[PDB]
Amino acid sequence: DDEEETYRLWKIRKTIMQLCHDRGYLVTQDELDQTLEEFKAQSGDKPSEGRPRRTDLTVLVAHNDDPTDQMFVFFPEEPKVGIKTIKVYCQRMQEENITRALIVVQQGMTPSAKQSLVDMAPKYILEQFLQQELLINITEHELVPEHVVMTKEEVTELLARYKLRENQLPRIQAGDPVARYFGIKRGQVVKIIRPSETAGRYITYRLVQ
Amino acid sequence: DADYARLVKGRIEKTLLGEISEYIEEVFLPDDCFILVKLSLERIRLLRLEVNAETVRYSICTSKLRVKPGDVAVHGEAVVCVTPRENSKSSMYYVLQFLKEDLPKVVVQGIPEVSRAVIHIDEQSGKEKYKLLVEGDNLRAVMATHGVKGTRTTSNNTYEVEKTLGIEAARTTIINEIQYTMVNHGMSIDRRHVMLLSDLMTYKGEVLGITRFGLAKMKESVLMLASFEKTADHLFDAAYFGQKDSVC
Amino acid sequence: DQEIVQMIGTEEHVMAAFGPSLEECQKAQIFTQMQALKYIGNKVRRQ
Amino acid sequence: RPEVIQSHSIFEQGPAEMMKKKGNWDKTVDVSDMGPSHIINIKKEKRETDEETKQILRMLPKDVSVAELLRELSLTKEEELLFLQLPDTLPGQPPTQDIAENACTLADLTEGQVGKLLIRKSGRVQLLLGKVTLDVTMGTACSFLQELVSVGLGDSRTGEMTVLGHVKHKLVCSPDFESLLDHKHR
Amino acid sequence: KQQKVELEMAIDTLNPNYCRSKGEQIALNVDGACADETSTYSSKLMDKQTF
Amino acid sequence: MLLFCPGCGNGLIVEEGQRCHRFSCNTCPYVHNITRKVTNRKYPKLKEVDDVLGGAAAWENVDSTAESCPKCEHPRAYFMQLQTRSADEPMTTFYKCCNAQCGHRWR
DNA sequence: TTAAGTGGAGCTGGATGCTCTGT
DNA sequence: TCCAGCTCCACTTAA
RNA sequence: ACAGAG
Ligand SMILES: [Zn+2]
Ligand SMILES: [Zn+2]
C-alpha cells in the first residue's frame, strides 16, 4: 500500500477539521481545503510519516466563547487503546489545562478503557471516535438533514411558542452519530431542517436525552 | 468505465484464501511437518486484488486457534507455510486435519459480512454509469472503502442506517422503503401517512417496532397494554409496581 | 476405525467429511465394544 | 504486526516460484541408513481404498465372465480358486434321502459330472446343469483377503487346519427366468 | 458347532515398525508386573495378536 | 489423509520420535518412520474468470508473428489461455476479435 | 496469579383473521 | 410454525 | 368438536 494509508490520514484529518469547524472552533481556510498532493509536503509517505504524535491537533481554540477553551485531537497507533495510553494522554492534557480531547482509535478500545472515559472526570471529557466513522463526513450525507444546536434564548422561545415543557419534545440519543459529531450533551436542543419534496423546508426539534 | 468498478468491487466482496490458491498441501518431512499454501498469482493479477504472500500472513494470525506470527513464513512471493502447534485444549496435535479444511475459508481481502456484489447498468440514452449493489450487512465498511462515494450510498435496513447515520436518516429510510414497496405493487398512499408512521417509530430517539415490545416502550397505559398481548403479565406488574393508569 | 470408514465411503471428500468424527472417539477412551456400551449406559434415561 | 503491507507491479517469474517451492521441501534426512530409521516395505500403512493401498512407493474398469475364463485358459495355465453362488434350488431330486418336493442343494447330490459350462459368442455365459441352463455373471468385486481353509476334526479333541489357497473372483449363478417363462407363459 | 474360530498370530519385535517403548507399557497394563502364572503375553512385550 | 494400521486398523496419528517423525497407532506398538518426503495436495476451486476478462482487460499473450483470426484475416484480435478450474485442468484456448463494424466472440 | 467486564450460545415463553349458519 | 429476553460459560485485559 | 358461506 502506502498510497491507501496516506489517503486515510488525509480524509480523517479533513473530516476532523470540518468537525472542529462545525463545533465552532477556529479553523483556517487552508486547513479545510488541504489537498492530497499538498498533504504529501509537511508529512510524506509512511516511513517519514508518523501517526501517533505528528498529526495531533491542539491549535483549536473555541474562538466564539473564549481563546482559553481549547481541545485536542489524538491519533493513537495501537489498534486497541488501553488505560495506560489514556493515562498518558490524560496527564499531557492535565499539564496544558485543556479540558476536551478527541481520541481517534483505529480498530477499537478495550472495555476497561471505555469505562474510564465515563468517570475520569466530568471536567475532563474525552470522546471516542473510530477512524472508520471519520472516513465519511456524515453531515454531508444525502440522508442526513442540517442539524443546528440551539441557544438557550431560542429554546426558551420554542417552549414559549407551543407552551411546552422540555420533556414533551421528541428525543435524540447522546449515542447518535450526529449527536457525537456535534458533541452535544443532555438538555441541549437541536433544530433539524428537513428538506421538502418541494423547494420548501420543514423545521422540527429534538431534545438530547 | 468497468475497469474501476471491478477494483473496488474486489475491495468489498469477500474472497477466501482457498479461492486464490491453486493448491494447498500437507508436507511431512523427517525433521518437521507443516501445511503449505501456494498462491495463484496469475489469478491475483487478473482479479485486481491487493494481496500477496506478505498480506496472507496478516489474514492468518487473527482468530485462528491462537496461531503464532513466528509459525507463519513467507519463503517466496507465492508461498506460505503454517507450522501447526498443539491446541492444548480438547485436541490432539494432529489438528492439521482441522486446518486442512479450515485454512481455505479464511478471508484475505474484503468485508466479512458481504456475501456478494454485482455491477448494475443503466439503459438511458443520455449516459452510461455503473452502480454497485452490495448484498450484505455492514454499511459502515462500504461507506469507507476507497472509491465508493460514501455520501450517496444507502441501505434497506433501518437498524444499519440508525447505527451508522442516526435517527433522522433512519426516519427517511422507513419513508423510502414503505413507499418503494407500495409503488411496486401498484398501490398508492399519500406521503403524509407513511410520514406519520415513521415519526411515531422514531420520536423517542430509537427505532421502535410496532411489535408488543415497541408498544410497551411507547404506551404508558396498563389497560391498553393488557388489551393487546401478554394480558396476564402486564396486570401483575401493575399490581407489583402499584401503577396508576390514566383512563385518558 | 477402518471398517467404519469402509462402510461410510472411500472417496476422499467423503473421508474428509467423516474425519472430525473419528477424532472425537479417539479423544475419549472408547476403543472397545464394552467401553462403548458403558458410555451409552451412562447416558440412558432410566424409565 | 505492521499492517500497511507493500506491493509492486513486477510480474513473478514462473521458474522463480518453482525453484523457491522446490528448495522449501526437497531437503531430506534419508542419510540415516540405520535399523530404526529403516522401514519394512511389506508393512506399509494402509491407504483406505484397498485396491489403492500404496501411498508411499519405491519410486479401474470391470472384467466380465468371458474375459475371466479366457485369462485362466490361454494367458496363464495356473490353477485358481473361484467362489460361486448357486440358486437356492438346483433342478434335482434328493436321491433316496427320505424327502415333499423339498429344496435340492449340492450337499444332496453325488460325485461325478454335474453339468457343462458354455461360453457363447458376444460374451454370454451359461451353466447347463441338466435340461435347464443357468446364467452366470460376475459378483461384487471383493478386494479384501479371502482364504480357503480346511478344518478337520480327525480326533475327539484335536485336529488339523490347512490353508488351501486365496480366493480372488466371485461368480453368481441365476436362473434364466425369461427362458423358463417363454416356454409356457401364464 | 456354532462355528467360532479364533487365531493367535505372532508379531516380531526386532523389525523397526515396533515401538518397544510403547510395547512395554501396553504389556504392563494388561499383565501384572511379575506374575506370569496366567498371562496373555509371556515376554515383557506384546507378542501376539488374537483374531 | 487417513492412514490406518496394518495390525488392528485403528486410525494413525503423526508423532515425533527420537530419530524421525512417525505415524503411530494409539492402541498397538506399530509405528512407521517417515524417511522421505510425503505430500497430499487439495487443489481447491478458483474464482470464475468469465466476467473478469471482458471489457478491455490487461491481457498480454500476443506476440510477434501471431496468427490472424479466421474470419477477418487480420491480427486485430486478442487470444489467451487460462485454467477455468484448478491447475490440473488442461488449459483452454479462447480468443475475441474487435474491429470496425464487426463484433464477434469465438472459440 | 486472579477480579472482572463483556463476547457468544442455549433455554424459555410468547404469538399466529373476521363473522354467521348448522348438527 | 417463527422470534425477543434471561442466564450460563469461556476469553482476553489489568492489577 | 367438525362442516359450510362470504
Ligand atoms: Zn494399530
Ligand atoms: Zn473483428
UniProtKB/Swiss-Prot annotation, chain A:
InterPro entries: Arch_Rpo5/euc_Rpb5, RNA_pol_Rpb5_N, RNA_pol_Rpb5_N_sf, RNA_pol_subH/Rpb5_C, RNA_pol_subH/Rpb5_CS, RPB5-like_sf. It comes from the Eukaryota. There is a cross-link at K80 (Glycyl lysine isopeptide (Lys-Gly) (interchain with G-Cter in SUMO2)). SUPFAM superfamilies: Eukaryotic RPB5 N-terminal domain (SSF53036), RPB5-like RNA polymerase subunit (SSF55287). PROSITE patterns: RNA_POL_H_23KD. One of its GO terms (cellular component) is cytosol. GO terms for molecular function: DNA binding; DNA-directed RNA polymerase activity. Keywords: Acetylation, DNA-directed RNA polymerase, Host-virus interaction, Isopeptide bond, Nucleus, Transcription, Ubl conjugation. GO terms for biological process: protein stabilization; transcription by RNA polymerase II; transcription elongation by RNA polymerase I; tRNA transcription by RNA polymerase III. Pfam families: RNA_pol_Rpb5_C, RNA_pol_Rpb5_N. It is found in: Nucleus; Nucleus, Nucleolus. HAMAP family: RNApol_Rpo5_RPB5. Component of the RNA polymerase I (Pol I), RNA polymerase II (Pol II) and RNA polymerase III (Pol III) complexes consisting of at least 13, 12 and 17 subunits, respectively. Pol I complex consists of a ten-subunit catalytic core composed of POLR1A/RPA1, POLR1B/RPA2, POLR1C/RPAC1, POLR1D/RPAC2, POLR1H/RPA12, POLR2E/RPABC1, POLR2F/RPABC2, POLR2H/RPABC3, POLR2K/RPABC4 and POLR2L/RPABC5; a mobile stalk subunit POLR1F/RPA43 protruding from the core and additional subunits homologous to general transcription factors POLR1E/RPA49 and POLR1G/RPA34. (Microbial infection) Interacts with HBV protein X. It comes from Homo sapiens (Human). The gene is POLR2E.
Curated annotation (Swiss-Prot), chain D:
The modification Omega-N-methylarginine is found at R1. It is found in: Nucleus. There is a cross-link at K43, K54, K184 (Glycyl lysine isopeptide (Lys-Gly) (interchain with G-Cter in SUMO2)). Sumoylation on Lys-43 can serve as a signal to mark misfolded Pol III for proteasomal degradation. Component of the RNA polymerase III complex consisting of 17 subunits: a ten-subunit horseshoe-shaped catalytic core composed of POLR3A/RPC1, POLR3B/RPC2, POLR1C/RPAC1, POLR1D/RPAC2, POLR3K/RPC10, POLR2E/RPABC1, POLR2F/RPABC2, POLR2H/RPABC3, POLR2K/RPABC4 and POLR2L/RPABC5; a mobile stalk composed of two subunits POLR3H/RPC8 and CRCP/RPC9, protruding from the core and functioning primarily in transcription initiation; and additional subunits homologous to general transcription factors of the RNA polymerase II machinery, POLR3C/RPC3-POLR3F/RPC6-POLR3G/RPC7 heterotrimer required for transcription initiation and POLR3D/RPC4-POLR3E/RPC5 heterodimer involved in both transcription initiation and termination. Belongs to the eukaryotic RPC4/POLR3D RNA polymerase subunit family. This is DNA-directed RNA polymerase III subunit RPC4. The chain holds residues 99 to 398 of 398 of the full protein.
Swiss-Prot record, chain E:
Component of the RNA polymerase III complex consisting of at least 17 subunits: a ten-subunit horseshoe-shaped catalytic core composed of POLR3A/RPC1, POLR3B/RPC2, POLR1C/RPAC1, POLR1D/RPAC2, POLR3K/RPC10, POLR2E/RPABC1, POLR2F/RPABC2, POLR2H/RPABC3, POLR2K/RPABC4 and POLR2L/RPABC5; the stalk composed of two subunits POLR3H/RPC8 and CRCP/RPC9, forming a structural mobile part that protrudes out of the core and functions primarily in transcription initiation; and additional subunits homologous to general transcription factors of the RNA polymerase II machinery, POLR3D/RPC4-POLR3E/RPC5 heterodimer and POLR3/CRPC3-POLR3F/RPC6-POLR3G/RPC7 heterotrimer. Coiled coil: none annotated. This is DNA-directed RNA polymerase III subunit RPC5. Transmembrane segments: none annotated. DNA-dependent RNA polymerase catalyzes the transcription of DNA into RNA using the four ribonucleoside triphosphates as substrates. Specific peripheric component of RNA polymerase III (Pol III) which synthesizes small non-coding RNAs including 5S rRNA, snRNAs, tRNAs and miRNAs from at least 500 distinct genomic loci. Assembles with POLR3D/RPC4 forming a subcomplex that binds the Pol III core. Enables recruitment of Pol III at transcription initiation site and drives transcription initiation from both type 2 and type 3 DNA promoters.
UniProtKB/Swiss-Prot annotation, chain F:
One of its GO terms (biological process) is defense response to virus. InterPro entries: DNA-dir_RNA_pol-M_15_CS, Rpa12/Rpb9/Rpc10/TFS, Zn_ribbon_RPB9, Zn_ribbon_RPC11_C, Znf_TFIIS. GO terms for cellular component: cytosol; nucleoplasm; RNA polymerase III complex. One of its GO terms (molecular function) is DNA-directed RNA polymerase activity. Zn(2+) 2 binds at C69, C72, C98, C102. Zn(2+) 1 binds at C5, C8, C25, C28. Its main location: nucleus. Transmembrane segments: none annotated. Changing R41W: In HLD21; decrease in expression levels of RNA polymerase III-transcribed genes such as 5S and 7S ribosomal RNAs. A motif (Hairpin) lies at residues 88-89. A zinc finger (C4-type) spans 5-28. A zinc finger (TFIIS-type) spans 65-107. It comes from the Eukaryota. It is found in: Nucleus. Keywords: Antiviral defense, Disease variant, DNA-directed RNA polymerase, Immunity, Innate immunity, Leukodystrophy, Metal-binding, Neurodegeneration, Nucleus, Transcription, Zinc, Zinc-finger. Gene3D superfamilies: 2.20.25.10. The keyword Zinc applies. It holds the Pfam family Zn_ribbon_TFIIS. Belongs to the archaeal RpoM/eukaryotic RPA12/RPB9/RPC11 RNA polymerase family. Core component of RNA polymerase III (Pol III) which synthesizes small non-coding RNAs using the four ribonucleoside triphosphates as substrates. Can mediate Pol I proofreading of the nascent RNA transcript. Anchors into the Pol III active site to constantly monitor transcription fidelity, cleaves mis-incorporated 5'-ribonucleotides and restarts the transcription process. Once Pol III reaches the poly(dT) termination signal, can induce Pol III clamp opening and transcription termination. This is DNA-directed RNA polymerase III subunit RPC10. It comes from Homo sapiens.
